[PDB]
Design a protein around this ligand. Structure first.
Ligand code: 47I
Length: 288
C-alpha cells in the first residue's frame, strides 16, 4: 500500500462516488472532523484501469504538492484522500460551473439563448480572482506552466479556482502538436522563452495570464484560431501580439501587452497585477 497521512485520510465508506467529471463527482460525509453528519459535494481524482506505476507516481506527486502549497480561496484545494486498502482517491474541491472557457462561452450574449450574462465588473473580477490565486501559488514557489481559462474552474458561487497547479509535466516530453479535448494548441499560451528554450518561471506564467485576460475579454475566444504550431513560432519570432478584444478598455489591453513583454524581467508580477486589477474592479461599471 501507500504510507498513511492522518492529516488527510478519509475512510473509504464516507465517500459516495457519482458520475464522471479520471475525475468523478462524489459526496463526502463528515469531511470536517467537527461536522460528521454534513455531505459535501467533492471531486475525486483516481487512476484508470490502464494506469502504470508512472501514472500512480504522478498522482501521488500532485497530491503531495497540494499538501505542501496549502489553502487559498482561488485555487482548487485538497480536502482529503483515500490511500489505504483500495485504489488511491485524491479528494479536491468541486467547481459546479466547470472551466472558465465553458463558463464564459455559456454567458455570451444571444447569437445561443443563455440564462445569464456577465457585466464589465464581473469580467474584471474574474481576472482579479485568477491573479490572486496565481499570486498565492507564486508565493509558494509554484510555477503553473499551463495557465489558461481551461485550467480555471468556477464554483456554484462563481469563485475562480486555479486547477492542475500540482500536475507533474515532463517538459522535454511535450508534444507541441497534441490538441486539448476542445481542439486547441496549448503552445498558444506559452511564453517564447518557455516555448523555444524550455525555461518556465513565474514570468512565463504572467505571459500565460496575458493570454487568459484575452480569453476573458473575448468571453472564451480561441487564441490564434486556424494557426498551426510552425506558423505560431514565426508569429512569436516576429513579435506578433494579438489584437485588442472589443469590449476591452485600453487599460486592460495595455495590461495584456505588459504581460506579453518580450523581456521576462519587464513583465508585471502577479503581486502588481492583483493591485492594478483591485483598482480597476472598483472603477468598472456593473451596469452593462
Ligand atoms: O488534477 C486534477 C485535480 C482536480 C481536477 C478537477 C476537475 C474538474 C472539476 C470540477 C468540475 C465541476 C463541474 C463540471 N461540469 C461539467 C461540465 N460543465 C458543467 C459543470 C466539470 C468539472 N470540479 N472540481 C474539479 C476538479 C482535475 C485534475
Amino acid at each position: 500500500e501507500l504510507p498513511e497521512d492522518p492529516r488527510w485520510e478519509l475512510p473509504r465508506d464516507r465517500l459516495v462516488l457519482g458520475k464522471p467529471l479520471q475525475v468523478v463527482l462524489a459526496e463526502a460525509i463528515g469531511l470536517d472532523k467537527d461536522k460528521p453528519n454534513r455531505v459535501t459535494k467533492v471531486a475525486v481524482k483516481m487512476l484508470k484501469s490502464d494506469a502504470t506505476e508512472k501514472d500512480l507516481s504522478d498522482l501521488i506527486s500532485e497530491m503531495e504538492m497540494m499538501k505542501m502549497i496549502g489553502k487559498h480561496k482561488n485555487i482548487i484545494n485538497l480536502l482529503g484522500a483515500c490511500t489505504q486498502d483500495g485504489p488511491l482517491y485524491v479528494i479536491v474541491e468541486y467547481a459546479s460551473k466547470g472551466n472558465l472557457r465553458e463558463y464564459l462561452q455559456a454567458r455570451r450574449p444571444p447569437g445561443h439563448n443563455p440564462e445569464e450574462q456577465l457585466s464589465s465588473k464581473d469580467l474584471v473580477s474574474c481576472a482579479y480572482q485568477v491573479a490572486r490565486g496565481m499570486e498565492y501559488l507564486a508565493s509558494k514557489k509554484c510555477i503553473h506552466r499551463d495557465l489558461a481559462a481551461r485550467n480555471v474552474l468556477v464554483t456554484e458561487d462563481n469563485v475562480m479556482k486555479i486547477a492542475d497547479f500540482g500536475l507533474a509535466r515532463d517538459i522535454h516530453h511535450i508534444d507541441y502538436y497534441k490538441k486539448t479535448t476542445n481542439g486547441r494548441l496549448p503552445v498558444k499560451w506559452m511564453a517564447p522563452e518557455a516555448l523555444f528554450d524550455r525555461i518556465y518561471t513565474h514570468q512565463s506564467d504572467v505571459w500565460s495570464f496575458g493570454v487568459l485576460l484575452w480569453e476573458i475579454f473575448t468571453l472564451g475566444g480561441s487564441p490564434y484560431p486556424g494557426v498551426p504550431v510552425e506558423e505560431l513560432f514565426k508569429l512569436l519570432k516576429e513579435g506578433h501580439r494579438m489584437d485588442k478584444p472589443s469590449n476591452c478598455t485600453n487599460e486592460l489591453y495595455m495590461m495584456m501587452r505588459d504581460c506579453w513583454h518580450a523581456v521576462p524581467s519587464q513583465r508585471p508580477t502577479f503581486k502588481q497585477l492583483v493591485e492594478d486589477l483591485d483598482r480597476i474592479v472598483a472603477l468598472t461599471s456593473n451596469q452593462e
